[PDB]
Amino acid sequence: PLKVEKFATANRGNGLRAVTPLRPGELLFRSDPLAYTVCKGSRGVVCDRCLLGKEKLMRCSQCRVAKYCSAKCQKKAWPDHKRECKCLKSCKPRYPPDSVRLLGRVVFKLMDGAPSESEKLYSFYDLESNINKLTEDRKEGLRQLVMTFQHFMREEIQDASQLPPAFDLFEAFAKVICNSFTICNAEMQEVGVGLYPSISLLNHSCDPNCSIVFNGPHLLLRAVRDIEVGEELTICYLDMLMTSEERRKQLRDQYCFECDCFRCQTQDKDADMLTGDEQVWKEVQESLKKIEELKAHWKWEQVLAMCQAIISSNSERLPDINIYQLKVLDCAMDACINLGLLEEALFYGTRTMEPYRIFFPGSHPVRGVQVMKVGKLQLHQGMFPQAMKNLRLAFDIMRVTHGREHSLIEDLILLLEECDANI
Numbered sequence: 527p528l529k530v531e532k533f534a535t536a537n538r539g540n541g542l543r544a545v546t547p548l549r550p551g552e553l554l555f556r557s558d559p560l561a562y563t564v565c566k567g568s569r570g571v572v573c574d575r576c577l578l579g580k581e582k583l584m585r586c587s588q589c590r591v592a593k594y595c596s597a598k599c600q601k602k603a604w605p606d607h608k609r610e611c612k613c614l615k616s617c618k619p620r621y622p623p624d625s626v627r628l629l630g631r632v633v634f635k636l637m638d639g640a641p642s643e644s645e646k647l648y649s650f651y652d653l654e655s656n657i658n659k660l661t662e663d664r665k666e667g668l669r670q671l672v673m674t675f676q677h678f679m680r681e682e683i684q685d686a687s688q689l690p691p692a693f694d695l696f697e698a699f700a701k702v703i704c705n706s707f708t709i710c711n712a713e714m715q716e717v718g719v720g721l722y723p724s725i726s727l728l729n730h731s732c733d734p735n736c737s738i739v740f741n742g743p744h745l746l747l748r749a750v751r752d753i754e755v756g757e758e759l760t761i762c763y764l765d766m767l768m769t770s771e772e773r774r775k776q777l778r779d780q781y782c783f784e785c786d787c788f789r790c791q792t793q794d795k796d797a798d799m800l801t802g803d804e805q806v807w808k809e810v811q812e813s814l815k816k817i818e819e820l821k822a823h824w825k826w827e828q829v830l831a832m833c834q835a836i837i838s839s840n841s842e843r844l845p846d847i848n849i850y851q852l853k854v855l856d857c858a859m860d861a862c863i864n865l866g867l868l869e870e871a872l873f874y875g876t877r878t879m880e881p882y883r884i885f886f887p888g889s890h891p892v893r894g895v896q897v898m899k900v901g902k903l904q905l906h907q908g909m910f911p912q913a914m915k916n917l918r919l920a921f922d923i924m925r926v927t928h929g930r931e932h933s934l935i936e937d938l939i940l941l942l943e944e945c946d947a948n949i
C-alpha cells in the first residue's frame with residue numbers, strides 16, 4: 527500500500543501528496559533508475575554499474591569506455607550496455623555529453639526492456655518538458671543535443687522505427703533538462719546522473735518536507751517533517767549553500783519557474799551567507815569553479831593546494847559562515863580525508879559544523895554525512911567524548927534522512943559501538 531499518490535496541483539503541474547499521515551524518517555518510496563550513467567569526471571574512477579570507487583577498474587574490452595569493479599558488475603551491466611557499446615566504440619575519442627549517454631540508455635531501455643518499476647507512478651512519456659517556456663537560446667542548445675545524439679547513436683538507431691513510438695528527441699532532451707537527478711555516493715560526491723520518473727513527481731521547495739538519498743544508483747525518498755493527509759510532498763532541487771538570487775537563476779534556467787516561497791520573498795539567510803568583504807568572496811567564488819572542476823575529477827592534491835591558498839591566505843580572509851568560504855573548507859576537508867591528512871581534515875571539518883547547523887536546518891542528509899565524517903575523524907584520533915557526541919548527532923539526523931534501508935546507517939552503528947566501547 528503506497529503512502530503517496532500522484533495528483534494535479536493548482537499551479538505547479540502534477541505532484542505527489544501524502545495518502546496517510548507521515549512522520550520524520552518514514553520511507554515513502556524507493557526506486558532504481560529508469561536509466562543512469564557515470565558522470566564525465568568519475569568515468570574510470572567509479573564502477574559504471576554500482577558507482578563505488580576503486581583504485582583499479584576493469585574495462586570493457588569492446589568499447590574500453592565502460593569500467594567496472596568486478597566481473598559480476600561488468601557482466602550484470604552487459605544487457606543495459608550492449609547497444610551503447612557499439613556507439614561508444616565508433617566514436618572514440620569523442621565522448622558524448624552525459625545527457626546524450628543518458629538518453630541513449632533511456633531509448634534502449636524503452637525499446638528492449640520490460641516495463642520499469644521506476645515508472646510505476648509516472649513514466650518518461652509523462653515527464654514535464656516545459657517546452658512552451660524555453661527561451662530561444664535554450665531551444666538552440668537542445669537542437670544541438672539532438673544532432674549530437676543522432677551522431678553518437680548512428681550505429682544503433684538509424685530511423686524512427688528504432689525509437690519508441692511518437693518519440694521526439696527534442697522533447698526528450700527537454701525532459702532530461704528538468705528531470706535529471708544527480709546521483710551522489712555515500713560521501714555526497716557527485717558520481718552519476720539518472721532518470722527516476724516516479725520520483726520526478728516531486729515539486730520543489732526551498733524548505734522541503736521530504737528528502738532523497740542515494741545508495742549507489744538506488745534512490746530512497748523519506749519524510750523529514752510531519753506531513754498531513756493531502757499535503758503535497760516537496761524536495762529541494764538545489765544545494766542549500768545558495769542565495770535567493772542564485773536559486774532564482776537556476777530555477778529559471780533549468781526548471782522554468784519562479785519561486786515565491788517565504789525564503790525567496792524575504793531573502794532568508796542571504797545576508798549571513800555573504801558576510802565578509804565582497805571583493806574577497808567574489809574572488810573565492812571564481813576560484814571555486816576551478817576547485818569544483820578538480821574535485822569532480824577526483825584531483826585531490828590539486829584541490830587541497832587551491833583551498834589552502836584561500837583558507838591560509840596572506841591576504842584578507844572570509845568568515846566561515848560565508849558560503850563560498852564554507853565550500854572551500856568542505857572541499858579541503860574532503861581532499862584531506864582522501865589524502866590521509868586526518869589532523870588537517872578535522873581542523874577544516876570542525877570549522878564547518880556551526881555553519882552547517884545554520885544552513886541545513888532540521889534533518890538534511892548533507893549535514894548528517896558531514897557530522898558523521900567529523901565524528902569519524904575524532905574517533906580515529908582518540909577524542910572519544912567528542913566523537914560520540916557527533917556520531918550520536920549524525921545518527922539523530924541520518925535515522926531520518928537515510929534510514930535502516932541505507933547501508934551508511936550500518937556503518938554508523940559500527941562507529942557508535944566502537945566509540946561506546948572505548949568510553
Ligand SMILES: C[S@@+](CC[C@H](N)C(=O)[O-])C[C@H]1O[C@@H](n2cnc3c(N)ncnc32)[C@H](O)[C@@H]1O
Pocket residue numbers: 537538539540541652653654656704705726727728729730731780781782783784785
Ligand atoms: C521534476 S518536475 C516536478 C513535477 C512536475 N510538476 C510535473 O508536472 O511533472 C519539475 C517541474 O515542476 C515544476 N515545478 C517544480 N516545483 C515547482 C514549484 N515550487 N513552483 C512552480 N513550479 C514547480 C516546474 O515545471 C519544474 O520544471
Ligand SMILES: [Zn+2]
Pocket residue numbers: 573574575576577578594595596599
Ligand atoms: Zn560494481
Ligand SMILES: [Zn+2]
Pocket residue numbers: 586587588589590591592607611
Ligand atoms: Zn563496451
Ligand SMILES: [Zn+2]
Pocket residue numbers: 731732785786787788789790
Ligand atoms: Zn523559494
